[PDB]
């Protein structure tokens, strides 16, 4: 794997990390490739790489959500490498984070998860925390488990389970 400096996101999507096309050619990454990222404390993330218009090839752009799953801040180092073997998910288990759901009343699957994953073929990893925009709300969800494990792509047939009680803030 190659080591890159973390920089702010251009694409604000949770599943995206961007690189300059020169860097992508160099690492032999193809637009829409799934990549495995490693940050601090043994933390890992699966994202989709996309081309970026910036100049510096020595930096990777990602949003706060990916930075937190990786336990890294702006300016830190992470490694990125191809992760070609990502399989469509049979089933995933995700639960909302308590503090983020306390005034929310709607159906979480219909309002948040369904529209979030719909035909976006997002890669997710067990342990990920992801933020989903719904109505006038943003709700955080934690990936409790996936099958295959520890990561998969949420495909149209991937069963999405969120049955259970909100996880507590650590």
């Amino acid at each position: 794997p190659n080591r890159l400096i973390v920089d702010e996101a251009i694409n604000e999507d949770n599943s995206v990390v961007s690189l300059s096309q020169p860097k992508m050619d160099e690492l032999q990454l193809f637009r829409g490739d799934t990549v495995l990222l490693k940050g601090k404390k043994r933390r890992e993330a699966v994202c989709i790489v996309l081309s970026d218009d910036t100049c510096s090839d020595e930096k990777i752009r990602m949003n706060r959500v990916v930075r937190n799953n990786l336990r890294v801040r702006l300016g830190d180092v992470i490694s990125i490498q191809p992760c070609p073997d990502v399989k469509y998910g049979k089933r995933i288990h995700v639960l909302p984070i308590d503090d983020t759901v306390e005034g929310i009343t709607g159906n979480l699957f219909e309002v948040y998860l369904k529209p979030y994953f719909l035909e976006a073929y997002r890669p997710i990893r067990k342990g990920d925390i992801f933020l989903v925009r719904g109505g006038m709300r943003a709700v955080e969800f934690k990936v409790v488990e996936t099958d295959p494990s520890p990561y998969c792509i949420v495909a149209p047939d991937t069963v999405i389970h969120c049955e259970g009680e909100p996880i507590k803030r650590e």
Binding site: Y88, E119, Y121
Partner: protein
């Protein structure tokens, strides 16, 4: 000159892969996936970030016009 490479993921997981001259119309791409077992009326071709139903774009536009160049990963999904 302009060549666009497309990686297309089938519902089973496997990737179809193919290079096209970017000047080629989208209908050439539609024909290629149909050349496999994924005809236009049974399956849609999706791009992501942003989400687009590629099979619902103007078949007479080139890859270049619809910006499917130089690289792109697409997904085949049964129409239902």
């Amino acid at each position: 000159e302009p060549v666009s490479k497309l990686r297309i993921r089938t519902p089973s997981g496997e990737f179809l892969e193919r290079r096209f001259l970017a000047s080629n119309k989208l209908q050439i791409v539609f024909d290629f996936v149909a050349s496999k077992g994924f005809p236009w009326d049974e399956y849609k071709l999706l791009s992501t970030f942003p989400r687009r139903d590629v099979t619902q774009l103007d078949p007479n536009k080139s890859l270049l016009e619809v910006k499917l160049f130089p690289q792109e990963t697409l997904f085949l999904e049964a129409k239902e």
